[PDB]
Structures are given as C-alpha cells and as structure tokens.
Symmetry: C4
Subunit: 354 residues, 4 copies
C-alpha cells in the first residue's frame, strides 16, 4: 500500500491499537513528503487504506464473531431470541453479504454460470457454503421448540465448521502457505484412511464387549461406556472395562509344578472350562496391542514420506502464483470490517438501485 514495506509486522499491530501511535515517530512511510510533513488526518487515513491493515481488521472482526457466538451458544442459549442471538444473525448476514457481493463485481462480461463453477470448484469456498447451508438449517431447528436440543447439536456443528476455517490465515504467510498447499493434496487420502481406522477400532471394541461379558440387554448403555472407552483407547489406553478386564482370572503359565518350588498356578481354565481365565485376557489384550499402535502408524508415515517427495518442489511456485488474486481482492475490497461494513453495503445497494 502507501506505507513503507520494511516496517515489519508487529508495528502494524501496535500502531493499530493506539491512534496517536501513528502520530508519533514510531512507524515508517515512503515518499518523505508525507512522512516528514505531518498531516495526521491524511496519514491515518492512508494507513487505513493499506490492504495489510484491512486484512488485519477482518481477522480481528472474525475473531470476535467466532468467540462471541461461542459464548452465546455456551451459556446464553435460550428459547426466546436473545439480543445476542439476533446480533450474530445480522453479523453473519453481513458477512455472507460481502461474500456474495464478490460474485457480481466482474468488470468484464463474464459468464454467470462460469464464475459460479469457479466458486463451486474451490475447496475453501466449498467449506464456506457447507457452513452456510448447515447454519440456515440449524436456525429453524432451534426456532422449533420441539427440537431445541437438536437445535443445540446443529449449532454446535456450525461453530466447528467456522473455527476450522481459520487455517486461511496462513495462506498469505511467508512460510506456511506452501504447506497448506501440501495438506490440500493430502486431504484426499487421509479421508480414506480415516475410514479404515474407524471400522478397524470399532471391530476391536465390539470384540472386547462381546467376549468379556454375557449379552447386554441394551446397546444403549453399552455405547455410553464402550464408545467413551473407545474414545479413550483410540490411542491404546483402556480396553473397555475400567472396572478390570477379567471379572475372574484363573490359571497361569505352565508352572507351579516345579519340583523345587512352585511359582504360579497351572490348569486348563481355557478349553475344558469356560474361556474366561487370565489366559484369555492376556491373549485378547495383547492382540489389540499386536496391531493397533503399530500397523496403522507405520502405514501413515509411509504414505506421507512417499507423497511429500512427490510435491516438494513445484509447491513453491504454485503458492507464489496463487498469491496474486488474494492481493487483488483486498486491494479492491471496501475498507470496512463486517460490523461497520453495513453502511458500505448500503452504498453498494445505492449504486445497484441507480
């Protein structure tokens, strides 16, 4: 923008805070006709036109939107539309308004369905509209008094979709963007792996829950314990019986018959008797460990060691190429954050009417 490009970044965040800090001699400009000749009003105004600053105002506004909404859903969730619930309603509206606005700006006569296909082809835009569709469903779900609790679950999912959106910060980074490109490549196969590990672990869970107990009258309470325990032992922790794996251990390795001195029990508790001795416990628990913490781990890191080396170099220039359109966007974007962008959306509608 207007200001000098060698001032670092922390000085932007600090001068953003204290208005007169711009008036002081703690920020740099170029073209000393304005740096030395101090008109604070124009200097602050020009400061506000730098896309770097407008970018940071957006990121701060987004931060506020996210954590405020979180608070409202956290404690202030109430059947009657609270003031804050309407606040985020209009706040989100103003945000999607700007998003949709950038679809019709085309100064040339671009095809309408063409630019739609491009938006619909972008992974990031795809996730954004996913949240929009999910929210607008959750809104009426909350509005219906018979589905308030579902209303909570959908709005909670919406929150998550918004908070994972912050990976966008580093797309303009000096040193992180390229790595975002890489994980964009990985997204495809880490999804598919996710599947197989899911069915993997639940097959182990139900195996445990089947053998170490008789039939349970309800699966309802089973999964309350079993899936919670699954959550915990996703990383090999608790088999599934916190109260102890074997309700009745028995028998021990071939020993105790030592003519010199017994060491431990030794009897067929196993085939001749109900398979519920410590021996079965050893077999089952070691089986889980035989595969869980090893097979899937070496597999993944092999996948990544492979794929990484396939994209390591050209990923650089691709990021550099991508840099353009983002810069063009915020260069031309109106200088107002979403809370105060409404008056600029009114100006746009004024142009839309005339």
């Amino acid at each position: 923008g207007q200001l000098s490009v060698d001032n670092g970044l922390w000085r932007v965040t600090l001068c953003m805070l204290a208005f007169p800090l711009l008036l002081t001699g703690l920020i740099s400009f170029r073209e000393k006709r304005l740096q030395d000749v101090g008109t604070p009003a124009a200097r602050a105004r020009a400061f506000f036109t730098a896309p770097v600053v407008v970018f940071h105002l957006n990121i701060l506004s987004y931060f506020a939107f996210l954590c405020l909404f979180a608070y409202v859903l956290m404690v202030d969730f109430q059947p009657v539309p609270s003031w804050c619930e309407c606040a985020i309603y209009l706040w989100l509206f103003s945000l999607v308004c700007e998003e949709m606005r950038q679809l019709f700006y085309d100064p040339d006569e671009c095809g309408l369905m063409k630019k739609a296909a491009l938006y619909f082809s972008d992974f990031w835009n795809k996730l954004d509209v996913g949240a929009i569709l999910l929210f607008v469903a959750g809104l009426t779900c909350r509005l219906i008094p018979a589905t308030l609790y579902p209303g909570r679950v959908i709005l909670s999912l919406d929150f998550i979709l918004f908070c994972l959106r912050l990976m966008h910060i580093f797309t303009i980074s000096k040193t992180l963007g390229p790595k975002i490109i890489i994980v964009k490549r990985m997204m495809k196969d880490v999804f598919f792996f996710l599947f197989l590990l899911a069915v993997w672990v639940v097959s182990f869970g139900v195996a445990k829950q089947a053998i170490l107990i008789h039939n349970e009258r309800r699966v309802d309470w089973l999964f309350r314990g079993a899936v919670y325990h699954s959550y915990l032992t996703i990383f090999g922790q608790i088999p599934g019986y916190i109260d102890g794996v074997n309700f009745n251990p028995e028998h021990c390795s071939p020993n105790g018959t030592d003519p010199y001195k017994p060491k431990c029990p030794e009897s067929d508790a196993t085939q001749q008797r109900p398979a519920f001795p410590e021996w079965l416990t050893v077999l089952l628990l070691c089986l889980y460990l035989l595969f869980t913490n090893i097979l899937l781990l070496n597999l993944l890191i092999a996948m990544f060691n492979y794929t990484f080396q396939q994209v390591q170099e050209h990923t650089d220039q691709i990021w550099k190429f991508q840099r353009h359109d983002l810069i063009e966007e915020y260069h031309g974007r109106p200088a107002a954050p979403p809370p105060f962008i409404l008056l600029s959306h009114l100006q746009l509608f004024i142009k839309r009417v005339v």
Copy 2:
C-alpha cells in the same frame, strides 16, 4: 464397461440407490445411440454389467455380511442354532463357494497343483484361508455345549480376521494401492519388531510387579491387574499400581540439613533400610521412561525412513502391472452379489452336471 468413463464415482453410488435415477438425465453414457434413445430396461441392464457396479455390489454385500454377523455374535449368541446363525452359515458358504469356483475356471489346461501353488503363494489368499480354517474350527467349538465360552473366543477371532480383510478395497484405488504394496513389504520386519517390543515391555512389567510388592499368592490376579495396566501403559501411562506406586515413601534428596532453612528429608532409607523409599520409586519410574518411549520409537522411524527410500519408485509400475488381473476377474465374474449369487452357482452346477 459400457458406460462413459468420465462420470466420476459419486454418481455411481447415487444412481445405484435410486432405480429411476438411471432413467433421469443425471448419468452419462457413450455411444449416444443408447444415451439419447432411451430404453430404460436395457440402460439399467447395461449399467448392471459394468464391473465398477458389480464391484460396488460386492463391497456393499460384504459390508452387510460383516456387520450383521457382528450383531449376531454381539447379543444374539445362543446355544441353540438361531435363525441368524444359520443365515451367516449359508452366507459364508456362498462366499467361499465363489472363491473356490475361481480356481477351476481355467480355459486352458493349466496344471492343477500349479494354480494351487499360486493361490497358496498369495499373501491375501493366505489370510483368506486362515479365516476359513479358523471359522470351521470355531463352528464345532460352539456346537459343543461344554465349550460354548471358547466358542465365543474363536468366533470373535474369526470376526477380526474378516474385518482386517477390508484393506482390499484400496488395492484398486487410484492413490492408495501403491502404499498397500509398500506395507506388504513392511509386513515382514514389523512382525519381528513386534516380538522384541512385546518381551521388552513385559520384562518391565514383571520388574515393577516384583519389587514394589512381596510375593503374590496367585499370578492369576496379578495379570488381571498387571496386564490390564500393561495394556494402558503400552504408551507410558500407569506403572502398574493405580493405588499409588510407593506404598510408603521415605527419604529425600540430600537436603533438610541446610543451616539456613531445611527443604526436605534426607536419610539412608535405601541401602541401610528396606529399599522401598521414594528414592527407589524415582529410580524405577525414571528407568521405565529412560527407554520405553524413546529407544523403540526412534528405532522404528529409522527403519521406515530407510526401507521406504528403497522401494519408493518402482512400486508405481508394479501396481500398474497388478491392475490387470483384478480387472479381468470382475469383468468375467457373474453379475450377482453373494445373497443372490446362489442361483448363478446353481447355473454353474447345471453346467457342471451337463
């Protein structure tokens, strides 16, 4: 197959669901003499001949077989042959029937023991027959009323052997197959490592269980606690005494004699007195940590970093080469999933008789 090869894959799964979705204009064909001139009966029929579809019907049938059997073993396990127990009996039979069928199809006069050696040489076929042998043993084990509980343990193991078989899905993948090839290389040495880590951790477990308690009358209850705790601390979590490691701590680092101001105890609780003070606890617990979460981890990732770079390139063309025979198989495979494949097995036997 007959249909166009550029329709993606989600459209196959969606058109699979809704019969008239084929009749609608939401799926592509080639040779517009059939795409434009709509005979729905032939269009759906031709759709059903595509090996891509027959593949998906198999994968859905297999999914159902696995989860239904799981349910039956989960809760409906009962001494008297339940209806569902017989259902999976015949369902599995129909599945191994098709498998054995593909051993005798050879249109040329191939040696009988030759094609047997090839089947027996295939790791995947090896695992399949492992499950077959284990199941058929478990069947009679359940049938004997004196070994019902063992019957549960064997059938549970059978289930696991079937569920790990699903890695076969991605052998036809665009981007995962090659990595399956790699782990097929790794299978050899990750097994051998598995051994040494097993004896490693149990040596630590028995060490703990030996020193921090007097002789236990039964190893039976020991392993009920010790091996469960081992399961948990497979990843360095609980030493083995959830009730606290030291039943009686004592003594502290050389301190407390500070002429200025004491800081902590300081006495030989150690050599002169029974080695059961906090000092021994510090020594033992840190010893576990000295090696467990470090030695074996850096070892493995070194192994993989090494071996990966030995197979990284030619693995590609090997997968491409392997692609053929699978495609040939499902091209020629009769178009019926296992539940409904029985009538086609009857047609084959009709040819076998005449």
Copy 3:
C-alpha cells in the same frame, strides 16, 4: 588449552573431582617437560586455565544455582526474606554482572549502540534478558505482602525460563549443535502452528461442554474441569465428562426389529426427541477423533519433512563458523565460577576505578 587434546572428556570430569587425581598418572599432557617433570602446583594451576575446565565449572555452578533456587521456591518460600532467598538474589546478581561485563570489554573503539544491537539481535541473549525482566518484576511482586501468591506464580515462571536455557549446553557439542541450529529455524513456524492447535482444541472443548449439559451457572468451575480434561485429552483421552459422556443414552442402530431375533433398540431419540441419546454421543465423540489425532499430526510431519531438506547441508559449516566466538569468549573469560567470581569482579572494578 595447555593439556593434551586427546584425553577424552570423562577424564576431565573425574580429575575435576579428586584433586590428587591430577597428581596421579591418570591424565595426559603435551610437552612432556611438564608431564614428566611433576610440579603438582603448576600442573593443577595449568589444568585450571583450560577453557574446557572453566566451561565445566560454569555448567556445574549453573546446575547448582538452578536446583537450589528450585528448592527455595519449592518449600522455603516465606514472606520474610529467608537467608536462601538473599543467597540466590546475590547469586543471580553476580551472574548478570558477568553478562553485562562482557558488553564493555571491546578492546577496539566499537560503537556502543552497535554492540547493543548485536546483543539485542541474538535469540539467546533475547531469552536471557526476558528472564531478567521477568525476575526483577517478580521480586517486588513477592515483596508486596498483598500479592504474595502472584509472587509465587511469577517466580515459578522465572524458574522455567532459566531451566529451558540449558539447551545452550549442546551448542558446543560435536554432534548436537547443528541440530540446535535447525530448531532455531523451526522456532518461527512451530510457534504459529502452536496457535492454531490451541484454538482448535478449545473449540472442541467448548463444543462438548455446550451440548452434553445445560447452561452452567459459573464458567469458574467449568474450566477447572474442562481445561484439566483438555490438558488430559490434548492427546485424545477424555472427552470432558469423566463421570460418563452421556448422562442418559438411548436408541440404537437400526436393529431389534429383526424378525428372526432382536439385536438392539431402535427409535428416533434423536430429532423427534431431545438430542441426548447414545447416537449423539457416537456422533460427537467420533467427530473429535475424525480430526484431532490425524489432521494436525500429518500436517506437522509434512512441514518438518519439507523444511529439514531445505537446511540439511549448509547447517554444518554454519555451526563450524559459529564455533569461534564461543571459544574466544571462554579463553579470555576470568577463571572463576559465579560463587567465587565476586573477587574477580572486584578486581575488575579496581581497574575500573583506576
């Protein structure tokens, strides 16, 4: 220094312990005019001039400073200035005295602000002065009786800043220094990743704490449980309800209607009824696992696999280049550890006065 360079290192640490061990024939010298002709007084004196030894005396003194201060803060923390509190006060003073001393030694007429900029440009010096500023604030915070407890928190933070400083040991290592250089490169982006994972997990925490309970009257007790549970499940362990995830499970996968034999419940506990059945529990708990233990892990190891290969080679010579100034420093540094360096600081002030 004076002594032979091929004696290894353990012999330095052992001869350091036992004064007459120098007098014995268990250490090497060069220039056998002193090795064979034994003047123990000069031999031990010359031994004390070797920067290798002076280095080790510093590292032992630093070790003592750190663990003694820890003890004093551990148990002997008391409102009235204890003897030991004053001991570390003067001990730290003597240490920063030597540090500041090395800023004015310049034998040439170097610019004063220049050498200040160089000190201020050094990451390691930056962390050192961070601790100095934090300590001197904590000192008066403790001194104020109304903020004793804050006094504890600041002094505890100070301790941590000192103990992480010990990575400096290996900067002179044969084989570790170069790797310190690498992580100095990594410091930048592992910080930024730290941010996104922080906001990531807390978004999941508040999501859990929002849906599986009604509004809590106080966030105070929430975070006492929720952030402790967050600490635990930073690595996917406990969702947030150790007392069980679902306070009331209900409904089960589409089953139980099996005309042959029921397997589990099956009812809309979900949309038609308050979204608090086991089905919601399965959805939420698996969602956490869908992303937490996978997305961020493969991301990081991709980042490191990338950046490592960008610095792997020239890092070597850079370390070799850096080696000089450290050697020059301890060569010229006065031969006294901080406890006994005071008399040498007096000699320096004597030169400063005259």
Copy 4:
C-alpha cells in the same frame, strides 16, 4: 553347514522339535549320497553340526534362562538359597564360562592385552560385562539379610540388563541387522537428549507442585504422587493433581457485563487477590502444553531425519563385512547348549590340564 541352504527356516524350527521329523522326507540335504541313502543316526548328527541349529539351541536356552530366572525372582524369592536360585547361579556361571573361554582360543600368539582391548572396545561386550558386574554385586547384597530388599532391587536391574540383550538376535538377520547398526550410531545422541528431556519435565513438575499448593511438610509423599503423576504425564496426561487442578477456581474471561445477557464471571481474582483462580489454572496448564508435546518431538524427528541420511548407504556393506566373525564363531563353537555345555567345558579343562 552340511544341509542344503534353500530349505527356509521354519523347517529348521519344526524338525528341531520332532526327532523323527528328520527321519521323514520333510527336510532337504545336499549331496544325495546322504539324502537318499538314509542313515538316520548320521543324518541327525550332521543336522546337529549345522551352526544354524546350534545358534537356535542357544537362543532357546537363553530364552529359558531368562524366563526361569524371572519366575524365581518373581515369586520364589526367599532368604534361604532356594534350589532354583542355585540353578540360575550355576547356569549363569556356565554361560560366562563359555564367554571367557572364547578369549583364550587364539590359535596364533596374539597379545593378551590386545584381545582384551578389543573385547573392551565392543559395545555389546561392554553391556555384557556390565550385567556381570551388577549381578555379582547383587548376589552378596541378597546374601546379606539386612539388605534383602536392596537385594531385590539390584537383581531386578540385572534382569533388565539381560532382557535388553536380546537385540542380538537380529544382528544376523537378513533385513534387521543393518538397522541395528544405525541405532548403534544413534545411541550417542539419544542419550544426551534423554538428559535434557528429563530435567525439562521435572522442572515442569516441581513448578506445578510449587504453585498449586502451599508448602508440603514432606517431599517424601510429594514424589510418591508427583513422580507417579510425572510418569503418567510424560506424554501429557495428568498435570499432577488427579483430585482436580484448581482447589478453588474463580473469575472468568472478560464477560458477564454484557448489557444484553451475562455469559460468565469477570473479576480480578488474579493480581489483586491470591493468584489461585481458574485464570492461573488456564495459564499454567496451557503453558505445559505450549512446549511439552511439541518442542521436543519436532526436535527429535529432525535429528533422525538428519542423521539417517548420513549413514543410509554404507551401512549395508558394513553389515555384510561384520557377518564373517559371527559365522566363524559358531562354526567353531562346541555343539552343546549351556545346560549341557558343562561336560564340554570339562573336556576343555581336560585339555587345559594336559
């Protein structure tokens, strides 16, 4: 040896079990003058001369020694020399007897101190004599009735030194040996890292234990809890207060003053009041996470990614070179396992006498 080299390995282990399995046609030979012309006595005898078999007999005997000793120390530990205690005494004696025996076999007139230096230079021999010195100390420690409990701790350490010795198995492996070479390179720096992570985590432990409680009267009970909790949270699990981190949470993020609707508390519980509110808990717990599960992990994997690529290639031929002397050893080694090697040690002493 005598038998054919293409028989695999499982057939060795199976024919080892069943004596007549050698007499059957399920094992291969070369020089069919003996394969076809069956003299079972000579065939089994020749089988017993193959170093491959003698190797396996040693590995089985060693396995038995280790697990039997474990049992004896596990439960049968008793002040009076038990029969089994004397059994392992003589068993170990017979083992070190063979080891020392291989020091004097030199058919040439090799220097006595030379071959001693070579033995003392070998890492593996170094660990072996470490166990010997530790055992022989533990023996008399047990023998003294006043130090029985220390006797337990030393013998338990001895056990560990023996069980980690089994990594020797894979030194003759086809595919693992080379990787053992690599970790032999790593041993140096993983030790040094071990140090810094140790002092790292305990600095965090004492920090926690200092701030979240007043002075404890005894460090004795502190470490019983704190070091056990440290053991658990070595991988970021439990801070140190399983009973809850904050004994009294208070204050909440700047909120609750929302003119629309309160969300949470908001007061200076922090500086103006004793620093023991939830805010301090958030600060401390996140601080632990800021560094523990990230800094040290990316550091290590960087170290290994670096060093691995420095040794990846020549490690191969080094293993191949090393292969010789092991083969020569067991070729010439007398054909008897330690239990039955005694009679062959007698024959050697017979030669030693005459």
